[PDB]
Amino acid sequence: KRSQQAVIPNIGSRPRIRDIPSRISIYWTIVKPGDILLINSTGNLIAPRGY
Amino acid sequence: DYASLRSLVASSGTLEFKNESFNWTGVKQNGTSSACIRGSSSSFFSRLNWLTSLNNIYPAQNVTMPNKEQFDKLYIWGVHHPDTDKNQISLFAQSSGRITVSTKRSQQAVIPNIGSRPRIRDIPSRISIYWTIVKPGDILLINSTGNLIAPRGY
Amino acid sequence: GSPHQILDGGNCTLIDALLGDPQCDGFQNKEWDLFVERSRANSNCYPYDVP
Ligand SMILES: *[C@@H]1O[C@H](CO)[C@@H](O[C@@H]2O[C@H](CO)[C@@H](O[C@@H]3O[C@H](CO)[C@@H](O)[C@H](O[C@H]4O[C@H](CO)[C@@H](O)[C@H](O)[C@@H]4O)[C@@H]3O)[C@H](O)[C@H]2NC(C)=O)[C@H](O)[C@H]1NC(C)=O
Ligand SMILES: *[C@@H]1O[C@H](CO)[C@@H](O[C@@H]2O[C@H](CO)[C@@H](O[C@@H]3O[C@H](CO)[C@@H](O)[C@H](O[C@H]4O[C@H](CO)[C@@H](O)[C@H](O)[C@@H]4O)[C@@H]3O)[C@H](O)[C@H]2NC(C)=O)[C@H](O)[C@H]1NC(C)=O
Ligand SMILES: *[C@@H]1O[C@H](CO)[C@@H](O[C@@H]2O[C@H](CO)[C@@H](O)[C@H](O)[C@H]2NC(C)=O)[C@H](O)[C@H]1NC(C)=O
Ligand SMILES: *[C@@H]1O[C@H](CO)[C@@H](O[C@@H]2O[C@H](CO)[C@@H](O)[C@H](O)[C@H]2NC(C)=O)[C@H](O)[C@H]1NC(C)=O
Ligand SMILES: *[C@@H]1O[C@H](CO)[C@@H](O[C@@H]2O[C@H](CO)[C@@H](O)[C@H](O)[C@H]2NC(C)=O)[C@H](O)[C@H]1NC(C)=O
Ligand SMILES: *[C@@H]1O[C@H](CO)[C@@H](O)[C@H](O)[C@H]1NC(C)=O
After folding, report:
1. Which residue of A23, B58, C25, C32 shows the fewest CB atoms closer than 10 Å?
2. Could you give the CA distance from residue B54 to residue B52 in angstroms, rounded to a whole number?
3. Which family does it belong to (chain A) (predicted)?
4. Cβ(B106) to ligand 6 under 6 A?
């Protein structure tokens, strides 16, 4: 209710680390009492398992 | 980030350049502009290569350069910002470009922005400047489908 | 409030006054030397997010 984060994936070749040319970007969010966390995704989402 | 690059170059203390032979395939290099006049003919930046289409074809590029030496290497590259879609098609044969410059420890992905800007020296276009640092044992990978201003060395 | 010009903002944040909040209509074309923001300040217009 106080912040928004919109991310679009980037496709391209990166140097291989342990035989993987793809990467993962890590983001974080904070939810205060009385607030609600809304996740709206169409793809490329690494979901959280908890808090 | 103009102040950051200025501080880096000022604290470095040198403008020593070493030419590297990047393997660009199926493109037209050594672009020229009417604003950048060297002597009496048109020119461009000396340390920056402008890559346009050849025969209305701009093949995708995937170029690697390893650091086999014992010091850090600074690469200065850029991204073109055409004023209109017609200019983008006439220069890079595609509608939207994507540039990915990556090392084993970092990645920068950039998408050009098409739009009209005030004319400086009769040009409504702009060029954004980015830099990358490669440490010993690292590898620089440039993967661009368009709108790439390439480095000519380190 | 004698030596310094002081503008009191109740129910009105400075950004809300700048944007033109319905409750911020009294702060138009006003000058100050110190803007005092209160803890009861709230917004009553379209939601916004200044980056
Ligand atoms: C863009 O160009 C980059 C290079 O700049 C390229 O990345 C390279 O891809 C090749 C091919 O996938 C990678 O080679 C592999 O690397 C490791 C270590 O050697 C191994 O997993 C692989 O070995 C296999 O293949 C060998 C040859 O057949 C077999 O003998 C072996 O048994 C395995 O089957 C293979 O060598 C290479 O590591 C990267 N290099 C990098 C990332 O620096 C990338 O693929 C290009 N992107 C495209 C074409 O989209
Ligand atoms: C969006 O809006 C912008 C801003 O209005 C607009 O940019 C303007 O484009 C015109 C295109 O003609 C520019 O005019 C030219 O500018 C320079 C400096 O004057 C000269 O190169 C040109 O002079 C030639 O053309 C004249 C007209 O025929 C001749 O009389 C003269 O002898 C020369 O041959 C010409 O004046 C104008 O400067 C800009 N203005 C800016 C950038 O502020 C833009 O075109 C609009 N549209 C789009 C799609 O972006
Ligand atoms: C990254 O480099 C690769 C390798 O050239 C590009 O992949 C090519 O993309 C074009 C355009 O879609 C295809 O026609 C080719 O078949 C692809 N080559 C393959 C799959 O070997 C890729 O477009 C480049 N750019 C990005 C942003 O990833
Ligand atoms: C946000 O989530 C909603 C959940 O419905 C998505 O809406 C659906 O989008 C798909 C793909 O366009 C449509 O086929 C469906 O009909 C939509 N459902 C509706 C309208 O009830 C929406 O796409 C999501 N947006 C993002 C950016 O992830
Ligand atoms: C800020 O808003 C509050 C809450 O509305 C105002 O206080 C009273 O609000 C009630 C409705 O809840 C009205 O009926 C009263 O007339 C308001 N009191 C007044 C106008 O004195 C409050 O006035 C607003 N302004 C400030 C500076 O606090
Ligand atoms: C661009 O100019 C360089 C010298 O500055 C030359 O070596 C190279 O072959 C040229 N590329 C072309 C003509 O495509």
Report:
1. C25
2. 7
3. Belongs to the influenza viruses hemagglutinin family.
4. no
In this complex, do B100 and A17 lie within 8 Å of one another by their Cβ atoms? no
From the centroid of its chain, how far is CA C23? 9
In total, the C-beta contacts within 8 angstroms joining chain A to chain B are: 27
Supply the DSSP symbol for C27.
Answer: G
Residues of B in contact with A12 (CB under 8 A): 98, 100, 102, 107, 109, 143
* B116 CB-side CA count, 13 A: 1
Residues 6+ positions from A37 with CB-CB distance below 8 Å: A29, A31
The C-alpha atoms of residue C26 and residue C28 are separated, in whole angstroms, by 6
**Chain B contact set for A20 (CB, 8 A):** none
- Tokens standing for A21? 């040319």
What approach was used to elucidate this structure? cryo-EM
The token pair at B103 is: 């090392």
- CA distance linking residue B25 with residue B23, whole number of Å: 6
Which position has the token pair 């690494």? A46
